[PDB]
Design an enzyme around this catalytic site. Sequence first.
Site, PDB file in Angstrom:
ATOM      1  N   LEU A  21       0.830  -1.200   0.000  1.00  6.71           N
ATOM      2  CA  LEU A  21       0.000   0.000   0.000  1.00  6.71           C
ATOM      3  C   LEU A  21       0.859   1.242   0.000  1.00  6.71           C
ATOM      4  CD1 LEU A  21      -2.580  -1.037   2.721  1.00  6.71           C
ATOM      5  CD2 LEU A  21      -2.476  -1.648   0.291  1.00  6.71           C
ATOM      6  N   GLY A  22       2.088   1.100   0.485  1.00  5.09           N
ATOM      7  CA  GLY A  22       2.993   2.231   0.532  1.00  5.09           C
ATOM      8  C   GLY A  22       4.437   1.823   0.759  1.00  5.09           C
ATOM      9  N   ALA A  23       5.362   2.634   0.265  1.00  7.16           N
ATOM     10  CA  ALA A  23       6.787   2.361   0.433  1.00  7.16           C
ATOM     11  C   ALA A  23       7.481   3.688   0.643  1.00  7.16           C
ATOM     12  CB  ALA A  23       7.347   1.659  -0.796  1.00  7.16           C
ATOM     13  N   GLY A  24       8.431   3.712   1.564  1.00  4.38           N
ATOM     14  CA  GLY A  24       9.114   4.958   1.817  1.00  4.38           C
ATOM     15  C   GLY A  24      10.471   4.764   2.433  1.00  4.38           C
ATOM     16  N   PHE A  26      11.526   4.896   5.531  1.00  3.75           N
ATOM     17  CA  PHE A  26      11.610   4.041   6.704  1.00  3.75           C
ATOM     18  C   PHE A  26      10.985   2.648   6.582  1.00  3.75           C
ATOM     19  CE2 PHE A  26      10.995   8.633   7.764  1.00  3.75           C
ATOM     20  CZ  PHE A  26      12.322   8.934   8.040  1.00  3.75           C
ATOM     21  N   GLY A  27      10.563   2.272   5.384  1.00  3.55           N
ATOM     22  CA  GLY A  27       9.979   0.949   5.241  1.00  3.55           C
ATOM     23  C   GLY A  27       8.767   0.875   4.345  1.00  3.55           C
ATOM     24  N   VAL A  29       4.418  -0.550   3.836  1.00  4.01           N
ATOM     25  CA  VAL A  29       3.156  -0.893   4.462  1.00  4.01           C
ATOM     26  C   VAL A  29       2.404  -1.794   3.499  1.00  4.01           C
ATOM     27  CG1 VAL A  29       0.963  -0.112   5.341  1.00  4.01           C
ATOM     28  CG2 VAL A  29       3.036   1.225   5.766  1.00  4.01           C
ATOM     29  N   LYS A  43       3.005  -2.854   8.762  1.00  6.38           N
ATOM     30  CA  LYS A  43       4.036  -1.842   8.570  1.00  6.38           C
ATOM     31  C   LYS A  43       5.367  -2.476   8.933  1.00  6.38           C
ATOM     32  CE  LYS A  43       5.119   2.878  10.210  1.00  6.38           C
ATOM     33  NZ  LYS A  43       4.481   3.938  11.030  1.00  6.38           N
ATOM     34  N   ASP A 134      -1.116  15.388  14.793  1.00  7.97           N
ATOM     35  CA  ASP A 134      -0.993  15.186  13.348  1.00  7.97           C
ATOM     36  C   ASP A 134      -2.373  14.916  12.746  1.00  7.97           C
ATOM     37  OD1 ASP A 134       0.244  14.892  10.879  1.00  7.97           O
ATOM     38  OD2 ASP A 134       1.302  13.043  11.397  1.00  7.97           O
TER      39      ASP A 134
HETATM   40  C1  LIG Z   1       0.011  -0.269   9.602  1.00  5.88           C
HETATM   41  C2  LIG Z   1       0.185   1.055  10.319  1.00  5.88           C
HETATM   42  C3  LIG Z   1       1.061   1.192  11.475  1.00  5.88           C
HETATM   43  C4  LIG Z   1       1.230   2.429  12.171  1.00  5.88           C
HETATM   44  C5  LIG Z   1       0.483   3.519  11.665  1.00  5.88           C
HETATM   45  C6  LIG Z   1      -0.413   3.470  10.530  1.00  5.88           C
HETATM   46  C7  LIG Z   1      -1.188   4.711  10.139  1.00  5.88           C
HETATM   47  C8  LIG Z   1      -0.564   2.216   9.840  1.00  5.88           C
HETATM   48  N1  LIG Z   1      -1.399   2.102   8.760  1.00  5.88           N
HETATM   49  C9  LIG Z   1      -2.745   1.504   8.928  1.00  5.88           C
HETATM   50  O1  LIG Z   1      -3.230   1.288  10.032  1.00  5.88           O
HETATM   51  C10 LIG Z   1      -3.680   1.202   7.888  1.00  5.88           C
HETATM   52  C11 LIG Z   1      -5.027   0.626   7.994  1.00  5.88           C
HETATM   53  N2  LIG Z   1      -5.714   0.499   6.810  1.00  5.88           N
HETATM   54  C12 LIG Z   1      -5.166   0.883   5.587  1.00  5.88           C
HETATM   55  N3  LIG Z   1      -5.906   0.820   4.415  1.00  5.88           N
HETATM   56  C13 LIG Z   1      -5.658   1.351   3.122  1.00  5.88           C
HETATM   57  C14 LIG Z   1      -6.332   0.700   2.022  1.00  5.88           C
HETATM   58  C15 LIG Z   1      -5.986   1.160   0.710  1.00  5.88           C
HETATM   59  C16 LIG Z   1      -4.982   2.256   0.590  1.00  5.88           C
HETATM   60  N4  LIG Z   1      -4.486   2.738  -0.595  1.00  5.88           N
HETATM   61  C17 LIG Z   1      -5.476   3.203  -1.534  1.00  5.88           C
HETATM   62  C18 LIG Z   1      -5.145   2.712  -2.937  1.00  5.88           C
HETATM   63  N5  LIG Z   1      -3.719   2.997  -3.163  1.00  5.88           N
HETATM   64  C19 LIG Z   1      -3.482   2.432  -4.483  1.00  5.88           C
HETATM   65  C20 LIG Z   1      -2.842   2.171  -2.320  1.00  5.88           C
HETATM   66  C21 LIG Z   1      -3.012   2.826  -0.953  1.00  5.88           C
HETATM   67  C22 LIG Z   1      -4.326   2.927   1.670  1.00  5.88           C
HETATM   68  C23 LIG Z   1      -4.688   2.450   2.950  1.00  5.88           C
HETATM   69  N6  LIG Z   1      -3.899   1.408   5.509  1.00  5.88           N
HETATM   70  C24 LIG Z   1      -3.101   1.602   6.577  1.00  5.88           C
HETATM   71  N7  LIG Z   1      -1.778   2.218   6.418  1.00  5.88           N
HETATM   72  C25 LIG Z   1      -1.033   2.715   5.294  1.00  5.88           C
HETATM   73  C26 LIG Z   1      -1.313   2.786   3.842  1.00  5.88           C
HETATM   74  C27 LIG Z   1      -0.392   3.371   2.853  1.00  5.88           C
HETATM   75  C28 LIG Z   1       0.858   3.914   3.346  1.00  5.88           C
HETATM   76  C29 LIG Z   1       1.206   3.885   4.749  1.00  5.88           C
HETATM   77  C30 LIG Z   1       0.260   3.283   5.712  1.00  5.88           C
HETATM   78  N8  LIG Z   1       0.293   3.109   7.075  1.00  5.88           N
HETATM   79  C31 LIG Z   1      -0.924   2.471   7.473  1.00  5.88           C
END
Ligand SMILES: Cc1cccc(C)c1-n1c(=O)c2cnc(Nc3ccc(N4CCN(C)CC4)cc3)nc2n2c3ccccc3nc12
Length: 271
Positions: A21-24, A26-27, A29, A43, A134
């Site tokens: 879902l994400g890359a950066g 620090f790592g 997700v 994460k 934040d």
């Molecule tokens: C796991 C964690 C630990 C500590 C703190 C946090 C906030 C999280 N943390 C969650 O709880 C967390 C919980 N649910 C989602 N759902 C989600 C579904 C589709 C997309 N999309 C939509 C469609 N695009 C294509 C991809 C991204 C984006 C998010 N994402 C999370 N993410 C993250 C998503 C992207 C990047 C970084 C992220 N960090 C977290």
Amino acid sequence: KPWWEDEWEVPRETLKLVERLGAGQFGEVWMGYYNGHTKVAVKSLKQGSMSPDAFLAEANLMKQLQHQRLVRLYAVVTQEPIYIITEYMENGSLVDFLKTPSGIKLTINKLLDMAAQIAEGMAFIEERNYIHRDLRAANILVSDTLSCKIADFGLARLIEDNEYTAREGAKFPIKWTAPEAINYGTFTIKSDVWSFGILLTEIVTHGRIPYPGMTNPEVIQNLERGYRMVRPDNCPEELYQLMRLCWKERPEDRPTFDYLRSVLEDFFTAT
Ligand SMILES: Cc1cccc(C)c1-n1c(=O)c2cnc(Nc3ccc(N4CCN(C)CC4)cc3)nc2n2c3ccccc3nc12
């Protein structure tokens, strides 16, 4: 508690990472599954990118702040690479969702509903003596049923007295942060209230950047003059006046999150 006694520690074998879902820096997700059937967000920390102690502090805080309106911590894997596993929110961040074909069609009634859901989560945080620091649309996650939850407690802090003083070097998003925080580095729940005001503009404009056409110094200049963000296009006046309460000069004059919740719920049922 040590990992062998900690309720949250789980074997890395229980997790299956399926989609990033994400890359950066620090790592990464990922969306994944716990024991095959439970969809979770994972994460992962990039060894060397930052202190592991720093990485897990967020998870430790979430062990302390549990509520239906806040993204729930699921587990942790404290062996490199360290993982933080949480409650998966199907529709991602609010700022992104409001831009999808679905988000775009949302009526003001549902936007106010969501706004109240967010204030509800903050009311809990407010009650437990914490601050988020934040608070912004990017940090509000949306579920498959279109319910919202507070996320990213990386800067969140338990407030032992009234305020938390950041470091003289710490930097924060100018457009979302309260004046006292930007100028003195002092944060209180009232600072979050200001951020909520800004977040309200993000909701009503379906994710638009606050203070349209203005650079950060322009924003600071205007604020110091007594000016506040110009009425967003198609923003209901009642909501605008609610935003202005969140932007009062004196932190102490800004309302409580419970008050904000209460009012927004009335706005909701009225529409
Ligand atoms: C796991 C964690 C630990 C500590 C703190 C946090 C906030 C999280 N943390 C969650 O709880 C967390 C919980 N649910 C989602 N759902 C989600 C579904 C589709 C997309 N999309 C939509 C469609 N695009 C294509 C991809 C991204 C984006 C998010 N994402 C999370 N993410 C993250 C998503 C992207 C990047 C970084 C992220 N960090 C977290």
